[PDB]
């Protein structure tokens, strides 16, 4: 629901257009890239499959084996977090996960 009071700033949404540009230049399928294109990119990140794997399991918002716009954004984000010299805690805070996964309680 746009316009109200509940606004959540998705951290990865501020530097998302970069991953968007990469997203489309990886050859997407129907606007969603598969584990093939994604993994190709992720191995060109030169990171181990273990780190990449936990990235996937956290970044796969749909839990659909694919990386959508927001999923791939999260993936690339965690990759560069490692590049910045950090670790992935295997936790997904409410403002790290797209607000599209929230129920109405």
């Amino acid at each position: 629901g746009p316009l109200g009071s509940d606004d959540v700033e998705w951290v990865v949404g501020k530097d998302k257009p970069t991953y968007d540009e990469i997203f489309y230049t990886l050859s997407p399928v129907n606007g969603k890239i598969t584990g093939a294109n994604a993994k190709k990119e992720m191995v060109k990140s030169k990171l181990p499959n273990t780190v990449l794997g936990k990235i996937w399991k956290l970044a796969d918002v749909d839990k659909d084996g694919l990386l959508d716009d927001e999923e791939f954004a999260l993936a690339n984000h965690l990759i560069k977090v490692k590049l910045e010299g950090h670790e992935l805690p295997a936790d997904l805070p409410p403002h790290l996960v797209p607000p599209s996964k929230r129920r109405h309680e």
């Binding site: 584990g35 093939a36 994604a38 993994k39 499959n49 273990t50 990449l52 794997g53 996937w56 399991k57 796969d60 084996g65």
Partner: peptide
């Protein structure tokens, strides 16, 4: 349940 792996990483 029986795992949750369908990712291109944990397949090897």
């Amino acid at each position: 349940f029986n795992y949750e792996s369908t990712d291109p990483f944990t397949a090897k």
